[PDB]
Amino acid sequence: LQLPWVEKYRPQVLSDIVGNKETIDRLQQIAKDGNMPHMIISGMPGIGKTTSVHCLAHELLGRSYADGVLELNASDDRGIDVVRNQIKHFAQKKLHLPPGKHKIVILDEADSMTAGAQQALRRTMELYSNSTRFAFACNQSNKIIEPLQSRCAILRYSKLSDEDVLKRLLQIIKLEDVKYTNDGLEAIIFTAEGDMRQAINNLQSTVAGHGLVNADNVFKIVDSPHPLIVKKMLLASNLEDSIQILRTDLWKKGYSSIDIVTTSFRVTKNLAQVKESVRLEMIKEIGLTHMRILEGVGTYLQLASMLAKIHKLNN
């Protein structure tokens, strides 16, 4: 069959990863040099952490990749016994590698690892660092215990810029010979919200549905991120405007009340314009409405009353 473009066009070399130019350049330097230290790679979903670690391991180990890499993720058994036996035996293995090259243990989604396993990892890292190096990949670097962080170089991946997403989208379009327009690519990038995976999925969906990637065609399938709609609803200077946004853009589109209130809390946490007193009062009202929704009264009237209270506070 035909693979989805998200997996079909997964970068296979470090030079095809867009964004985080400084970090990717440093990874390329490490690959060409060899002296890879223990590292932690943190960042939001779909920005290239897994791809970056895999590409770096491949470039470092060459043909020895099969015998020199041990990959484990949240879908595998990773308990304390695994650390005691499998990882320990891999780190004990004597493998002849070119100078400056070490075995690599990739621990994808390391944040989910249990406390006992993480504590056990300390001793193996202490003992087998001369021949083995650890690459953790996670979304929250703080979920790795401090004794493990103390041994690793930290690398934080930032959200991808519109320029990098556009460049990769153009490369994919050229490879696939896809017909498009500037407004269509703008809409895809705007709906991706910095997630390259979502951008590729939306591009593929639009192409399959209609082929030509225009703004109207993109917005027929893809929806604008509802956090922005919630921000617009909260920032409306008129009660009727907020109510109209809540009705037309969220309620009648099938968005659940619980999702609306959770997104409202998340957005209100990041409103830079408002004062602290107003912000905390809005948070209180959102929390009370959330309590009411959890009890079973998830009605449009409750959300309208929440908006009315927020507007009252703004005055």
Binding site: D67, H89, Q92, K93, K94, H96
Partner: protein
């Protein structure tokens, strides 16, 4: 083929498996040293309070072959030792997971084993994947063949000379039943063949006893409760006591129950006894209990004497224990209590 060895007899396979199992109980990883005359499997615990060593002579194996000069990969395991007579001996040492080797060496409940082969190939014509792997080939009586290749890590070998020093001290101190003279001659020959050389400080005590009585007494000993063993020898009897001291908590509450079980053997029963002129020695029991079960696994009728020899000098000094079989030497060294 850097090294190759084969075992065919059933009792030989039994003793090999038992030795590997005991060594695995002592430490997670066993150390194998191949020489031009013997294979040494040894183990030492984390606290360095116990050392176990089993040496299989080349005559033990049906086929034996060692070509150290062919080793290319894993060269860090190759060692050269200079003899006192001006000779160079080549050795190859490596470390292997004890549990894995024990599982490989165990006899299937239903199917028997015809031959058991262990080999190492680190020569030039060796694939990269197969480098640093111990090849094990097991032929079954049903013509089934099983193959294993557990990984190993080359290491350096540091011989232990406690046995040689104890033997020399015992010979100097106590060196008439003809058996005693035979023991003296055997010890002198062993010391001479080794690759290396009336104050109270020269205290030495030797006990040769039939291991059957000790094994019978220890069969009732549960190491989980009786963790200490005390040997008390005088000119009339030898007492072996498996014991455990009590522990009292804050308000004298019993945190750990004391226990003791003793067995006495007349000195007449003991094969030999030499004392430095009621000697007492205390050490750990688990390792001794496990070690006493290796020799009997073969059960050789010819020259069959499951006699254990013990040497001890002073509290806090090591206690040495020796057992022998037609082509196997078993050694156990333990640290003794320093009290008094």
């Amino acid at each position: 083929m850097s090294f190759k060895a084969t075992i065919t007899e059933s009792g030989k396979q039994n003793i090999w498996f038992r030795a590997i199992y005991v060594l695995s109980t002592i430490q997670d990883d066993i150390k194998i040293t191949v020489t031009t005359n013997e294979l040494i499997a040894w183990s030492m615990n984390e606290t360095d309070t116990t050392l176990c060593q089993v040496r299989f002579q080349k005559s033990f194996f049906e086929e034996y072959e060692f070509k150290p000069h062919e080793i290319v990969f894993g060269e860090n395991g190759v060692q050269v030792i200079e003899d006192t007579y001006g000779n160079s001996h080549k050795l190859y040492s490596f470390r292997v997971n004890g549990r894995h080797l024990t599982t490989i060496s165990r006899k299937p409940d239903g199917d028997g084993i015809k031959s058991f082969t262990i080999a190492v190939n680190n020569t030039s014509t060796c694939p990269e994947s197969l480098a640093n792997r111990l090849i094990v080939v097991i032929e079954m009586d049903s013509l089934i063949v099983k193959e294993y290749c557990p990984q190993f890590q080359p290491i350096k070998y540091d011989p232990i000379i406690i046995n040689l020093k104890y033997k020399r001290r015992f010979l100097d101190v106590f060196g008439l039943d003809p058996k005693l003279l035979d023991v003296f001659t055997n010890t002198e020959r062993e010391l001479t063949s080794a690759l290396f050389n009336l104050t109270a400080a020269d205290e030495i005590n030797y006990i040769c006893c039939n291991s059957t009585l000790l094994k019978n007494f220890l069969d009732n000993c549960n190491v989980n409760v009786t963790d200490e063993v005390k040997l008390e020898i005088n000119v009339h009897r030898l007492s072996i006591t498996a014991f455990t001291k009590a522990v009292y908590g804050k308000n004298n509450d019993l945190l750990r129950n004391a226990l003791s079980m003793s067995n006495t053997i007349s000195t007449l029963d003991l094969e030999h006894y030499c004392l430095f002129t009621m000697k007492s020695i205390i050490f750990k029991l688990k390792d001794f209990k496990n070690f006493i079960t290796i020799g009997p696994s073969w059960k050789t009728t010819q020259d069959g004497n499951d006699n254990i020899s013990l040497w001890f000098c002073h509290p806090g000094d090591p206690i040495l224990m020796q057992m022998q079989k037609p082509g196997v030497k078993l050694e156990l060294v333990e640290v003794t209590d320093s009290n008094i």
